[PDB]
Paper text:
XIAP (X-linked inhibitor of apoptosis) directly inhibits the upstream caspase-9 and the downstream caspase-3 and caspase-7, and therefore controls critical apoptotic checkpoints. The XIAP protein consists of several domains, including three zinc-containing BIR (baculovirus IAP repeat) domains (BIR1, BIR2 and BIR3) and a C-terminal RING domain. The linker region blocks the active sites of these caspases, while the N-terminal regions of the partially processed caspase-3 and caspase-7 bind the BIR2 domain in a peptide-binding groove that accommodates the four N-­terminal residues.
We have successfully determined the crystal structure of the BIR2 domain of XIAP in its apo form. We have succeeded in producing such crystals using a construct that spans residues 152–236 of XIAP (cutting off the linker region) and includes the same two cysteine mutations, C202A and C213G, as were incorporated into the construct used for NMR studies, presumably for improved behavior in solution. XIAP BIR2(152–236;C202A,C213G) crystallizes as a dimer, with the N-­terminus of molecule A occupying the Smac binding site of molecule B. However, this binding does not mimic the binding mode observed in the Smac, caspase or peptide complexes; rather, it is likely to be the key to driving the crystallization of the protein. In the apo structure, the binding site of molecule A is unoccupied (although glycerol from the cryoprotectant is sometimes observed in the P1 pocket) and is available for the soaking in of peptides or small-molecule inhibitors. Furthermore, one of the glycerol molecules that was observed in our initial apo structure overlays well with these serine residues. Furthermore, these crystals diffract to better than 1.5 Å resolution.
Numbering used by the authors:
A (entry chain C): 158 to 234
B (entry chain A): 151 to 233
The structure:
Amino acid sequence: PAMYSEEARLKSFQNWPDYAHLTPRELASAGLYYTGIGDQVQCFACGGKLKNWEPGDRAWSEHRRHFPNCFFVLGRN
Amino acid sequence: GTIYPRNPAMYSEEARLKSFQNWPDYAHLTPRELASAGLYYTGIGDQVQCFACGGKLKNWEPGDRAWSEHRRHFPNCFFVLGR
Ligand SMILES: [Zn+2]
Ligand SMILES: [Zn+2]
């Protein structure tokens, strides 16, 4: 329940690496929080994990691409 | 990509189906059902593994379905969530 809050997902992004190609805000808004390693993030609703973000990737697009049956993704759509 | 299968070669359902060549005769689930749910035989007992999430399942019981057990134990699997 700690990660339901978009604000609490932001706070997980302490130690988010400076190289990473997306921001804590964008990720948190798409339901994702930092797992604490690399540039890996996880969804608070489906638990799906995403990493190795590339320049130009968007948080929502990848989240919906790989975890289409996530309830949060299904509502966003 | 932003996701990555635990076992790329078992990416293929056909490759997964072939892994059941020596599936034991006591194991009641069919290779067809298991492979369709992303699972391939590890070669040990009745233990299968998902090519996507890498989760393992074994000690199957009557009325167990492959997809149901896969989703129950590994609900955040991209194969489960892409189905
Ligand atoms: Zn999700
Ligand atoms: Zn899986």
